[PDB]
Amino acid sequence: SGFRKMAFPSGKVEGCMVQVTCGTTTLNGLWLDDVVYCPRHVICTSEDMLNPNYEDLLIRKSNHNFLVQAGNVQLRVIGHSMQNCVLKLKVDTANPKTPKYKFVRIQPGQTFSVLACYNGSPSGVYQCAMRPNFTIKGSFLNGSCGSVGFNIDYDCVSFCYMHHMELPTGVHAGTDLEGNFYGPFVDRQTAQAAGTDTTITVNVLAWLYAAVINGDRWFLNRFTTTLNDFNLVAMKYNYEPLTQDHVDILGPLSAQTGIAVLDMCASLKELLQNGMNGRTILGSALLEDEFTPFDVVRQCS
Amino acid sequence: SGFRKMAFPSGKVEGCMVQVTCGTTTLNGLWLDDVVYCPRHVICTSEDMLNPNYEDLLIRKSNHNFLVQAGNVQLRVIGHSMQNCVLKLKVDTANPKTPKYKFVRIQPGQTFSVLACYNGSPSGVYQCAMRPNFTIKGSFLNGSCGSVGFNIDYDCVSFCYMHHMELPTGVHAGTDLEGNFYGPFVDRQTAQAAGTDTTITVNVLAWLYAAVINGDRWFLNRFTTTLNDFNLVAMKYNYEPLTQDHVDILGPLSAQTGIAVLDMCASLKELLQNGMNGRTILGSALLEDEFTPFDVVRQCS
Ligand SMILES: *[C@](O)(C(N)=O)[C@H](CC1CCC1)NC(=O)[C@@H]1[C@@H]2[C@H](CN1C(=O)[C@@H](NC(=O)NC(C)(C)C)C(C)(C)C)C2(C)C
Ligand SMILES: *[C@](O)(C(N)=O)[C@H](CC1CCC1)NC(=O)[C@@H]1[C@@H]2[C@H](CN1C(=O)[C@@H](NC(=O)NC(C)(C)C)C(C)(C)C)C2(C)C
């Protein structure tokens, strides 16, 4: 019983966090086998970041320009390369705490846990969703760059995010672990517009199913809608369109609760048109959209 | 920038979680040095739990009645004792992953991270507050008993909660790590009334300071109140009284933001009397009360 924003246990990732220093710039790195991954702008001075040519900046760097600290132990860099927006520092020692892992590039609307780190030391863990506009609403201060986002499936850590930058609205942007940014952003200190964000409709529906599983039921009704009629209301309230693939994904939850997906859409439509009128769902006065259907099944086990 | 419900990194606790089986009952245990701590009702059958005499039930148990599994390895119990509502199983092996640790009994309104576990395997981590009525609003399913709550300060894990039971409202109750329940509850399957809960006033104020630190400022005003006048409004809205000790604790946050504690009380009073009128604070449409002043200082670092 109960429903919380639940992150994955962070131990397997904690053992991979290191500190990377280049000149006067210090941030976090991810130590897997004998490679340390970190944002490539660790090689930049502040005046470099305004319009950097990373090829030129890196060609002027040597292995001894990179100071990597794994706790108390300093790791010797024996090689460096650049992949997209990440820097790969080959080190002399294989991380003995390397878990079974993969790199994955996630789709918008998917969730992951973030291990916030500073100077290579983990500070906290929390859940985030990749927004439809490919930003994330994290909690990041100066020094958090290189912190990673991840999911776990049995004994495998799927890394999906590395933190690079903060947007003027206080939201955050970064890359997959192969250095490709999510969204249209670039690692250059220049005006960059984030797209207008939207609400992740399939996640709101999954969260409504979690509420029913936990006994929150006041929002249900006997009406129904068509998938096409629901999407016309969703468009008005800046919700993402619901597809039949979304309906199929919500299959197991609909079967467990006995509430057809299109029936739950009718209840969501009324919540959008009427509001909640002083009531709450799972302790929230807002419609919550950073729980995936998998997140609900996992926690409501 | 940003503000999230942030749990402590869970790695140090993950290495302590084991599985304890007694007959047909299986739950989680905490393995520290050569002792395994778990809820004492692991020795109960379902008909025992309706009105158990734990002294009689335990006197009929032997060491070989306790099956402890640490991952793949089975731990041999060489001794057992009962402390309040916890069972202490002495094992033949000292846990090599034992962190620096303490047992602490927390005050209501304090927060902690929970590592939800099933069959000795960590499932997720989230933040909880000890409610004024000494329940917690966790996320616990069958098999989660023995999961622990904790805080971390540098390299020391302060354990403060072990999970025992679910209340009919879906809220949760448990003990400190020395077996003393929080609140009036007992580990017996009998009607037990939880006290009427209240809102943790000092935490709401801390969260309002976090909002100002992050640029959420619409709720401020130029009014002020007296501590006595504020507490009269707090009593009407089922908020806990604010003490001068609470005011002193909010000192560092008030100094960082330049907003006097009693000035923030005036803004909270207006939020209570008027509502938020379709606005949000730190992404919430409700006044949030499970962030302590320490939680804010830690995350808004
Ligand atoms: C990390 O590298 C770190 N050391 O933790 C750092 C985190 C930020 C939080 C303040 C310091 N990231 C950057 O410094 C990042 C590097 C330059 C500029 N960066 C920013 O995050 C800037 N944002 C920004 O200019 N955003 C746009 C370009 C306007 C959209 C800050 C103004 C927040 C510093 C680069 C390469 C993007
Ligand atoms: C744990 O021991 C476990 N194995 O995970 C278990 C968790 C609950 C969640 C359903 C199983 N806790 C108990 O079984 C606990 C043991 C008996 C009864 N318990 C309950 O949690 C019951 N609650 C309850 O009766 N609450 C009161 C007494 C009405 C306030 C359940 C009805 C939820 C099983 C004891 C000793 C309290």
Short mmCIF file of N, CA, C and O in Angstrom, two decimals, chain B residues 78-145:
data_model
loop_
_atom_site.label_atom_id
_atom_site.label_comp_id
_atom_site.label_asym_id
_atom_site.label_seq_id
_atom_site.Cartn_x
_atom_site.Cartn_y
_atom_site.Cartn_z
N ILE B 78 23.89 -18.80 15.32
CA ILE B 78 24.51 -19.41 16.49
C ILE B 78 23.96 -18.84 17.79
O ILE B 78 24.51 -19.10 18.86
N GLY B 79 22.87 -18.08 17.72
CA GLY B 79 22.28 -17.49 18.90
C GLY B 79 21.13 -16.57 18.56
O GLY B 79 21.10 -15.99 17.47
N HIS B 80 20.18 -16.42 19.48
CA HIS B 80 19.04 -15.56 19.24
C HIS B 80 18.62 -14.90 20.54
O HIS B 80 18.74 -15.48 21.62
N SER B 81 18.13 -13.67 20.42
CA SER B 81 17.61 -12.94 21.57
C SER B 81 16.54 -11.98 21.07
O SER B 81 16.46 -11.67 19.88
N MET B 82 15.73 -11.50 22.00
CA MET B 82 14.65 -10.57 21.70
C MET B 82 14.90 -9.25 22.42
O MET B 82 15.07 -9.23 23.64
N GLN B 83 14.83 -8.14 21.69
CA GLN B 83 14.96 -6.81 22.33
C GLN B 83 13.69 -6.03 21.96
O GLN B 83 13.58 -5.69 20.76
N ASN B 84 12.78 -5.77 22.92
CA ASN B 84 11.53 -5.07 22.55
C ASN B 84 10.83 -5.79 21.39
O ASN B 84 10.64 -6.96 21.52
N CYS B 85 10.67 -5.14 20.25
CA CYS B 85 9.93 -5.81 19.17
C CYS B 85 10.87 -6.29 18.05
O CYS B 85 10.39 -6.63 17.04
N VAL B 86 12.16 -6.32 18.32
CA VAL B 86 13.07 -6.83 17.29
C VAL B 86 13.72 -8.14 17.73
O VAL B 86 13.85 -8.36 18.87
N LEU B 87 14.06 -8.91 16.74
CA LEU B 87 14.76 -10.15 16.98
C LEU B 87 16.21 -9.97 16.55
O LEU B 87 16.48 -9.42 15.48
N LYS B 88 17.14 -10.40 17.41
CA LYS B 88 18.57 -10.29 17.14
C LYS B 88 19.14 -11.69 16.98
O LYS B 88 19.22 -12.45 17.95
N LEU B 89 19.52 -12.03 15.75
CA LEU B 89 20.08 -13.34 15.44
C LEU B 89 21.59 -13.21 15.30
O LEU B 89 22.08 -12.58 14.35
N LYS B 90 22.33 -13.79 16.24
CA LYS B 90 23.78 -13.83 16.13
C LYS B 90 24.17 -14.86 15.08
O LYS B 90 23.70 -16.00 15.11
N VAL B 91 25.03 -14.45 14.15
CA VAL B 91 25.45 -15.33 13.06
C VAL B 91 26.94 -15.58 13.17
O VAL B 91 27.68 -14.87 13.87
N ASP B 92 27.39 -16.62 12.47
CA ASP B 92 28.78 -17.07 12.53
C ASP B 92 29.74 -16.18 11.76
O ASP B 92 30.96 -16.32 11.94
N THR B 93 29.25 -15.28 10.91
CA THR B 93 30.09 -14.47 10.04
C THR B 93 29.80 -13.00 10.27
O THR B 93 28.63 -12.59 10.35
N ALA B 94 30.86 -12.20 10.38
CA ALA B 94 30.72 -10.76 10.44
C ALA B 94 30.53 -10.20 9.03
O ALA B 94 31.27 -10.58 8.11
N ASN B 95 29.54 -9.33 8.86
CA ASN B 95 29.28 -8.76 7.54
C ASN B 95 30.47 -7.91 7.10
O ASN B 95 30.75 -6.87 7.72
N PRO B 96 31.18 -8.31 6.04
CA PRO B 96 32.33 -7.51 5.59
C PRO B 96 31.93 -6.17 4.99
O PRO B 96 32.81 -5.33 4.77
N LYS B 97 30.65 -5.95 4.72
CA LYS B 97 30.16 -4.70 4.17
C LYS B 97 29.54 -3.80 5.23
O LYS B 97 28.87 -2.82 4.88
N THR B 98 29.75 -4.10 6.51
CA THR B 98 29.21 -3.29 7.59
C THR B 98 29.76 -1.87 7.50
O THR B 98 30.98 -1.68 7.61
N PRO B 99 28.92 -0.86 7.29
CA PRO B 99 29.41 0.52 7.30
C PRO B 99 29.55 1.02 8.73
O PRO B 99 29.11 0.39 9.69
N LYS B 100 30.20 2.18 8.85
CA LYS B 100 30.10 2.94 10.09
C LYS B 100 28.63 3.27 10.32
O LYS B 100 27.96 3.79 9.42
N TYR B 101 28.11 2.94 11.49
CA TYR B 101 26.67 3.08 11.68
C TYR B 101 26.34 3.44 13.12
O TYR B 101 27.15 3.28 14.04
N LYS B 102 25.12 3.94 13.29
CA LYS B 102 24.52 4.18 14.59
C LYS B 102 23.04 3.84 14.51
O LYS B 102 22.45 3.81 13.43
N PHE B 103 22.45 3.57 15.67
CA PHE B 103 21.01 3.50 15.83
C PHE B 103 20.54 4.79 16.49
O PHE B 103 21.11 5.21 17.50
N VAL B 104 19.53 5.43 15.90
CA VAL B 104 18.97 6.66 16.43
C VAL B 104 17.45 6.54 16.44
O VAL B 104 16.86 5.93 15.54
N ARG B 105 16.83 7.11 17.47
CA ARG B 105 15.38 7.21 17.55
C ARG B 105 15.01 8.65 17.21
O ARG B 105 15.39 9.58 17.93
N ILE B 106 14.31 8.83 16.10
CA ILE B 106 14.07 10.18 15.59
C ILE B 106 12.81 10.76 16.22
O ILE B 106 11.94 10.05 16.73
N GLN B 107 12.72 12.11 16.17
CA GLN B 107 11.57 12.89 16.59
C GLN B 107 10.56 13.00 15.45
O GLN B 107 10.94 12.96 14.27
N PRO B 108 9.28 13.14 15.77
CA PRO B 108 8.29 13.37 14.71
C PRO B 108 8.63 14.62 13.92
O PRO B 108 9.15 15.60 14.47
N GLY B 109 8.35 14.58 12.62
CA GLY B 109 8.71 15.65 11.72
C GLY B 109 10.05 15.49 11.05
O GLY B 109 10.32 16.18 10.06
N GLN B 110 10.91 14.61 11.56
CA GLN B 110 12.18 14.33 10.92
C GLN B 110 11.99 13.40 9.73
O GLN B 110 11.05 12.60 9.68
N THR B 111 12.89 13.51 8.76
CA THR B 111 12.81 12.74 7.53
C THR B 111 13.90 11.67 7.49
O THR B 111 14.89 11.73 8.23
N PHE B 112 13.69 10.68 6.62
CA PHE B 112 14.67 9.62 6.41
C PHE B 112 14.40 8.95 5.08
O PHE B 112 13.31 9.07 4.51
N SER B 113 15.42 8.26 4.58
CA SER B 113 15.29 7.46 3.37
C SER B 113 14.94 6.03 3.73
O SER B 113 15.43 5.48 4.72
N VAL B 114 14.09 5.43 2.91
CA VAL B 114 13.66 4.04 3.08
C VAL B 114 14.18 3.23 1.91
O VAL B 114 14.00 3.62 0.75
N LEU B 115 14.84 2.12 2.21
CA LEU B 115 15.24 1.16 1.19
C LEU B 115 14.24 0.01 1.22
O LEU B 115 14.35 -0.90 2.05
N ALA B 116 13.25 0.06 0.34
CA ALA B 116 12.26 -1.01 0.27
C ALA B 116 12.92 -2.28 -0.25
O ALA B 116 13.63 -2.26 -1.26
N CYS B 117 12.69 -3.39 0.45
CA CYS B 117 13.30 -4.67 0.12
C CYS B 117 12.27 -5.78 0.16
O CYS B 117 11.28 -5.71 0.89
N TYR B 118 12.52 -6.82 -0.64
CA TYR B 118 11.69 -8.01 -0.67
C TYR B 118 12.60 -9.22 -0.82
O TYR B 118 13.45 -9.25 -1.71
N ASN B 119 12.43 -10.19 0.08
CA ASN B 119 13.27 -11.39 0.10
C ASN B 119 14.75 -11.04 0.19
O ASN B 119 15.61 -11.68 -0.41
N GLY B 120 15.05 -9.99 0.96
CA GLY B 120 16.42 -9.55 1.16
C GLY B 120 17.04 -8.82 -0.01
O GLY B 120 18.24 -8.53 0.03
N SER B 121 16.26 -8.49 -1.05
CA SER B 121 16.80 -7.82 -2.23
C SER B 121 16.23 -6.41 -2.32
O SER B 121 15.00 -6.25 -2.34
N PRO B 122 17.08 -5.38 -2.36
CA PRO B 122 16.57 -4.01 -2.46
C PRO B 122 15.78 -3.79 -3.74
O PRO B 122 16.18 -4.21 -4.83
N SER B 123 14.64 -3.11 -3.60
CA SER B 123 13.74 -2.81 -4.72
C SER B 123 13.73 -1.34 -5.10
O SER B 123 13.68 -1.02 -6.29
N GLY B 124 13.78 -0.43 -4.13
CA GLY B 124 13.76 0.99 -4.44
C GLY B 124 14.04 1.80 -3.20
O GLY B 124 14.05 1.29 -2.08
N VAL B 125 14.27 3.10 -3.42
CA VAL B 125 14.60 4.02 -2.35
C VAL B 125 13.76 5.29 -2.50
O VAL B 125 13.53 5.76 -3.61
N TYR B 126 13.28 5.81 -1.37
CA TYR B 126 12.45 7.01 -1.38
C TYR B 126 12.55 7.70 -0.03
O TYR B 126 13.01 7.11 0.96
N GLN B 127 12.08 8.94 0.01
CA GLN B 127 12.11 9.76 1.21
C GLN B 127 10.80 9.67 1.97
O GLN B 127 9.71 9.65 1.37
N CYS B 128 10.86 9.69 3.29
CA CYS B 128 9.66 9.60 4.17
C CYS B 128 9.93 10.58 5.32
O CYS B 128 11.01 10.92 5.60
N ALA B 129 8.85 11.00 5.92
CA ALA B 129 8.88 11.79 7.14
C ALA B 129 8.13 11.03 8.22
O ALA B 129 7.11 10.39 7.95
N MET B 130 8.65 11.09 9.44
CA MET B 130 7.90 10.60 10.59
C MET B 130 6.77 11.58 10.86
O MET B 130 7.02 12.73 11.23
N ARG B 131 5.53 11.14 10.65
CA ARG B 131 4.38 12.02 10.85
C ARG B 131 4.23 12.37 12.33
O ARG B 131 4.70 11.64 13.21
N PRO B 132 3.58 13.50 12.63
CA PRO B 132 3.31 13.82 14.04
C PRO B 132 2.54 12.74 14.78
O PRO B 132 2.68 12.62 16.00
N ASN B 133 1.73 11.94 14.08
CA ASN B 133 1.05 10.82 14.72
C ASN B 133 1.87 9.54 14.68
O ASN B 133 1.33 8.46 14.97
N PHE B 134 3.16 9.63 14.34
CA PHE B 134 4.12 8.52 14.42
C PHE B 134 3.78 7.37 13.47
O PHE B 134 4.16 6.22 13.71
N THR B 135 3.06 7.67 12.40
CA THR B 135 2.99 6.79 11.24
C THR B 135 3.90 7.35 10.16
O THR B 135 4.40 8.47 10.24
N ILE B 136 4.13 6.54 9.12
CA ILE B 136 4.82 7.03 7.94
C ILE B 136 4.01 6.65 6.71
O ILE B 136 3.32 5.63 6.69
N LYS B 137 4.08 7.50 5.70
CA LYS B 137 3.39 7.26 4.43
C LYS B 137 4.41 6.69 3.45
O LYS B 137 4.98 7.39 2.61
N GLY B 138 4.66 5.39 3.59
CA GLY B 138 5.61 4.70 2.75
C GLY B 138 4.95 4.00 1.58
O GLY B 138 3.78 4.21 1.26
N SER B 139 5.74 3.16 0.92
CA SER B 139 5.26 2.29 -0.15
C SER B 139 5.77 0.90 0.20
O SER B 139 6.94 0.58 -0.04
N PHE B 140 4.91 0.09 0.80
CA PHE B 140 5.27 -1.21 1.33
C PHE B 140 4.24 -2.24 0.91
O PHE B 140 3.03 -2.03 1.08
N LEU B 141 4.71 -3.35 0.35
CA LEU B 141 3.86 -4.49 0.02
C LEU B 141 4.18 -5.65 0.95
O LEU B 141 5.09 -5.58 1.79
N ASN B 142 3.43 -6.74 0.79
CA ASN B 142 3.73 -7.96 1.52
C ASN B 142 5.16 -8.40 1.24
O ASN B 142 5.59 -8.44 0.08
N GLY B 143 5.91 -8.69 2.29
CA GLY B 143 7.31 -9.04 2.18
C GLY B 143 8.28 -7.92 2.48
O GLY B 143 9.49 -8.16 2.52
N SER B 144 7.78 -6.70 2.70
CA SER B 144 8.65 -5.55 2.93
C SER B 144 9.06 -5.40 4.39
O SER B 144 9.96 -4.59 4.67
N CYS B 145 8.44 -6.13 5.31
CA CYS B 145 8.81 -6.02 6.71
C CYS B 145 10.30 -6.28 6.90
O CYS B 145 10.88 -7.16 6.26
#
